[PDB]
Ligand binder design. Structure first.
Ligand SMILES: [Zn+2]
Lengths: 104, 60, 121, 65, 150, 40, 49, 174, 242, 36
RNA sequence: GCCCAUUCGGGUCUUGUAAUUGGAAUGAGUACAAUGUAAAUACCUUAACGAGGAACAAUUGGAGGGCAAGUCUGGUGCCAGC
């Protein structure tokens, strides 16, 4: 529905948006520029936990999903509608809790 | 890389027991439930009776 | 007007003493006159039974003044040896009592018996 | 000590057999050891130990029969 | 100096209210009868279809005074609420106001369930703890906090 | 004395819990009061 | 705790006072500083009133 | 099949305290047990409501209500005097799940707690007459309520003592 | 605790007539009318006063008396003042009527009725000792056959164990209780109705009272002492009910 | 209570036993040590 | 020292921490054997083994904290935020 009919879309990361944000674990630090493949466009996704931001580097064939805020936060930016849920085959929640291993 | 979980949290029958007998002992602090009655000889009410307090619901 | 007035007839006798045997097998019964009056003035007593042919009758006739003061039903039964066979014990017990317990599986029969004997008295 | 007990016995001279249901009751042992069962059944009947056959056993739950 | 804090009535749990045994006592009130009529459901069979249990309705003298006071548009409501199947209470307070009569009546007993429909009464009833309200909805009734609806 | 200071210490956390609760309720109601007006 | 580890929120112990200056010991950290400074500010304010 | 059903709302305060009280009182495992017993209670009294809302003297109401009360007195949740159909409408979940084997052997004695009752009858000790039952949720019928005793092939009855007892007898007789 | 020999202060309570006995653990205590003899085996405080005199006090065991549990749970006002006349429906034995008697005092009277016989002879053998009570051995369901000997009591109290509780108190209060007078009843839920539970049977009984013109004003449950009884205090209005 | 133990007031009654004196000495000494 | 209720109030050792610690019962397994079966597995049986961290290691979420001679941003000192 937010991209045709699918709930998830594979995508190619352009670059880690905001590496130069000084405040660690901030909204402008936790963004990536994903090239959606299903229609070939740009979008700004919202990877959780900047400590596990640095799994994804460049064309890591990332898999997005919606975000859906359940309230209002302190310094969260609006506009990001997409979060990262799977990167290059594995799920980055499992990567951040270090069960699996990112393959390359 | 997980939080320290609980031996009480392992078996659900135990966690639904140690939640009840706490909540069994919780409502000795909102009501005054019946606990058998006069067990020994009457040693007095043993915990304080105050004059200016009426715990009686009145009819408006 | 005798001294053992609420004397139960035959069918009510048989149901109250099979409730007696179920209570004795469920560990809910007090056997004997002085343990009966001890549990009676402790308060835990659903109802108490006496035997109307003990050779002194007063040694259990002292139980009316306690039980109908503390508001608990009481019933005479025409045979101490039948009540002994009911309680499941060698010597003839003459005064039994049923303790109060809401964790016992004869609560329905106890309440049926208690309602029948309150209608009897 | 075990016992065996047959029930529902029907003769059948269309095959010259007698077919029945077998209840073996063993109070503590595992099960009734079909060869030893077969020679005991041929002993209580008049059979061979070669002309008697049992097949459809199942031990019921909790053990014992 | 007599303070008065009412004890939590000892046939109540935290919020479970084990005093509501399945033969129910409900408290009918005025716009609930009116909405029952203009949704064309019944009363006793409607409550049975919503609760799957035998419900004894009650109306108070205050609510009967409100139903008489509301004039001749609701003669159907008054003929329905003078039903011999229902029982009747008898209030003793000043001022025929169904809202505080109802919420006082139920907060000093904690055994009645309240069959209401207006917003302020629903707010006060679900504000105070552990008594279930019911209300009209669609073409049936609806229960808000009974622990065994089914 | 130490019973009083323990009661004051936990009164501080009850105050912070009520602060979070009122903040969440106020943002929820200011969402609802404009959802009530977006039918215009 | 939303998305952090317990090793991410481990404890930081505080370092002692050096033995080289142990005669006037008890190195005085930030909480003791603020408990000194607000007391001094209150004393100065009541002195000035 | 799909016995258990999710209620009309599963995240609610009164329902949460209901499951807490019932679980900690009758010694239950999860919400699925209360939901199974509550479901089949709701099903049988939803079936009883239709037999009530149709008229009396119908053969359907007469012998189907007699069938329903015969089945319910056979399970034992209905007393011997209230043998008419609207007490089935006035049934409740407490005296319906009280007849499970866990609570029933605790009421019969021989277990000293509900949880010890559950762990021993899943450790295979209690047999209703002849059949060893290793499951709690039994709903024991009224006729076989007095046939509950320790099973003879179990060391709380009269069998050989257990492996802990005989191993300790060995390495305490050494 | 509270053994025989400790020194306990005797402070007065709100309900005039009763006293709090504050030691290291507290007691509820009424000032004994006939000194020197306990009536149902309770312990007695014994104070000295200055010609040296010595007056004694009784404890009030709430697990064996009804309204003592209501007093300790805290009722807003009773009507058992130190001057009034008090009727006692369902006076079992001395075990509560002696406490209501010595709360009432040497001027007011306590008319204690009782239906059974053996508690009747125990009540009379107690009643010869203190003079402010009147033992009646008649059924409480017939207030027209002891109408000869009592008149115009000032507060009734009720412990009878029959499922026509409201009819008993309504007939006795119409026949004897004065207007604007108190009525303190003690309903036992499991006694009067075993099928439906406690709050429903209490609401049904208090509705029967406000139909029989007693305007109720207090309901207390007395849960830590007895199970599922309740004390219901009411006035007898008869004129200007609302 | 025994006749050799019924003291003239509850202060001497509380002094007359042993466990209360033990608790009072250890609690009071810990309180003085905490104050210093 | 515990617990509960917009706050001052209420109620409770009959409340928590300790391998201080004791023996009893087990099936997950493991396995003679028999059972089932076309043959064999599984279940049903069952001798002998099989428990203290019963480590014979139950997870998935969610809500909060608190800590430095540490880091960064802002300013109306000693602060506010991330
Ligand atoms: Zn009204």
């Amino acid at each position: 529905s937010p991209f045709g009919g699918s709930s998830h879309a594979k995508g190619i990361v352009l670059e880690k948006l905001g590496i130069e944000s000084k405040q660690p674990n901030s909204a402008i630090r936790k963004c990536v520029r994903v090239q959606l493949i299903k229609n070939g466009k740009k979008v700004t996704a919202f990877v959780p936990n900047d400590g596990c931001l640095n799994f994804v580097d460049e064309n890591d064939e990332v898999l997005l999903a919606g975000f859906g805020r359940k309230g209002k936060a302190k310094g969260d930016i609006p506009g990001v509608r997409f979060k990262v849920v799977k990167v290059s085959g594995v799920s980055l929640l499992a990567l951040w809790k270090e069960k699996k291993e990112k393959p390359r | 890389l997980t939080p320290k979980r609980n031996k009480d949290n392992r078996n659900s029958r135990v966690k639904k027991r140690k939640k009840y007998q706490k909540a069994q002992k919780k409502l000795k602090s909102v009501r005054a439930v019946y606990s058998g009655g006069q067990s020994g000889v009457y040693e007095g009410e043993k915990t304080g009776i105050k004059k200016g307090l009426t715990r009686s619901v009145k009819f408006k | 007007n005798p001294k053992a007035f609420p004397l139960a007839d035959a069918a009510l006798t048989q149901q109250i003493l099979d409730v007696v045997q179920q209570a004795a097998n469920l560990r809910q019964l007090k056997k004997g006159a002085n343990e009966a009056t001890k549990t009676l003035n402790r308060g835990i007593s659903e109802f108490i039974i006496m035997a109307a042919d003990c050779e002194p009758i007063e040694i259990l006739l002292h139980l009316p003044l306690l039980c109908e003061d503390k508001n608990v039903p009481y019933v005479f039964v025409p045979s101490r040896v039948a009540l002994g066979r009911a309680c499941g014990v060698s010597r003839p017990v003459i005064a039994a009592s049923i303790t109060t317990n809401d964790a016992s599986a004869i609560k329905t029969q106890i309440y049926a018996v208690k309602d029948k004997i309150e209608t009897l008295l | 000590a075990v016992t065996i007990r047959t029930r529902k016995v029907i003769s059948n001279p269309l095959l010259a057999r007698k077919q029945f249901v077998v209840d073996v009751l063993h109070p503590n042992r595992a099960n009734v050891s079909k060869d030893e069962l077969r020679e005991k059944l041929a002993e209580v009947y008049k059979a061979e130990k070669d002309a008697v056959s049992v097949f459809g056993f199942r031990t019921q739950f909790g053990g014992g029969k | 100096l007599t303070r008065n804090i009412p004890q939590v009535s000892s046939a109540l749990f935290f919020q479970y209210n084990q005093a509501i045994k399945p033969p129910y006592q409900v408290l009918i009130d005025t716009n609930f009868i009116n909405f029952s009529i203009q949704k064309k459901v019944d009363i006793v069979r409607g409550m049975m279809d919503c609760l799957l249990a035998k419900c004894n309705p009650l109306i108070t003298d205050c609510v009967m005074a409100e139903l008489e006071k509301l004039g001749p548009k609701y003669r159907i409501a008054l003929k329905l609420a003078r039903d011999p199947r229902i029982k009747r209470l008898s209030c003793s307070h000043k001022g025929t106001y169904a809202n505080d009569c109802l919420v006082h009546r139920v907060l000093q007993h904690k055994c009645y369930i309240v069959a209401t429909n207006d917003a302020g009464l629903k707010q006060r009833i679900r504000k105070i703890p552990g008594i279930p309200l019911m209300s009209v909805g669609g073409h049936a009734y609806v229960i808000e906090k009974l622990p065994d609806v089914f | 004395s130490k019973r009083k200071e323990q009661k004051a210490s936990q009164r501080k956390e009850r105050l912070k819990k009520l602060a979070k609760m009122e903040e969440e309720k106020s943002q929820r109601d200011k969402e609802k009061k404009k959802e009530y007006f977006a039918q215009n | 705790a939303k998305l952090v580890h317990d090793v991410q929120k481990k404890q930081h112990r505080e370092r002692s006072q050096l033995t080289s200056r142990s005669r006037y010991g008890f190195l005085e950290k930030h909480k003791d500083y603020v408990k000194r400074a607000q007391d001094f500010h209150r004393k100065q304010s009541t002195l000035k009133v | 099949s799909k016995t258990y059903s999710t209620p009309k709302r599963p995240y609610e305060s009164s329902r949460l305290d209901a499951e807490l009280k019932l679980a900690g009182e009758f010694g239950l495992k999860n919400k699925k047990e209360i939901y199974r017993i509550s479901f089949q209670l709701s099903k049988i009294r939803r079936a009883a409501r239709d037999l009530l809302t149709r008229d009396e003297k119908d053969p359907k109401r007469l012998f189907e209500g007699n069938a329903l009360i015969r089945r319910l007195v056979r399970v034992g949740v209905l007393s011997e005097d209230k043998k008419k159909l609207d007490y089935v409408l006035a049934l409740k979940v407490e005296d319906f799940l009280e007849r499970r084997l866990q609570t029933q052997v605790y009421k019969l004695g021989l277990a000293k707690s509900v949880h010890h009752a559950r762990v021993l009858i899943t450790q295979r000790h209690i047999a209703v007459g002849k059949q060893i039952v290793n499951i709690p949720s039994f709903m024991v019928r009224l006729d076989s309520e007095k046939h509950i005793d320790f099973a003879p092939t179990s060391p709380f009855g009269g069998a050989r003592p257990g492996r802990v007892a005989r191993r300790n007898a060995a390495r305490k007789a050494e | 605790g509270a053994r025989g020999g400790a020194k306990v202060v005797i402070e007065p309570h709100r309900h005039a007539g009763v006293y709090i006995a504050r030691g290291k653990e507290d007691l509820l205590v009424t000032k004994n009318m006939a000194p020197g003899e306990s009536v149902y085996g309770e312990k007695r405080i014994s104070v000295e006063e200055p010609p040296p005199t010595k007056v004694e006090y009784r404890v009030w065991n709430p697990f064996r008396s009804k309204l003592a549990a209501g007093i300790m749970g805290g009722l807003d006002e009773l009507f058992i003042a130190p001057g009034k006349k008090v009727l006692y429906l369902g006076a079992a034995s001395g075990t509560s009527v002696s406490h209501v008697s010595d709360v009432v005092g040497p001027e007011g009277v306590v008319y204690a009725v009782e239906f059974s016989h053996r508690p009747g002879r125990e009540l009379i053998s107690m009643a010869k000792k203190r003079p402010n009570i009147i033992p009646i051995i008649e059924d409480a369901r017939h207030p027209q056959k002891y109408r000869m000997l009592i008149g115009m009591v000032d507060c009734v109290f009720a412990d009878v164990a029959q499922p026509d509780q409201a009819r008993i108190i309504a007939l006795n209060s119409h026949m004897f209780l004065k207007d604007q007078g108190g009525v303190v009843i003690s309903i036992k839920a499991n006694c009067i109705d075993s099928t439906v539970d406690a709050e429903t049977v209490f609401a049904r009984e208090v509705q029967k009272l406000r139909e029989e013109r007693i305007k109720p004003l207090e309901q207390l449950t007395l849960e830590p002492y007895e199970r599922d009884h309740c004390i219901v205090v009411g006035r007898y209005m008869r004129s200007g009910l609302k | 209570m025994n006749r050799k133990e019924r003291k003239s007031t509850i202060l001497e009654t509380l002094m007359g036993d042993e466990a209360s004196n033990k608790y009072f000495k250890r609690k009071y000494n810990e309180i003085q040590e905490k104050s210093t």
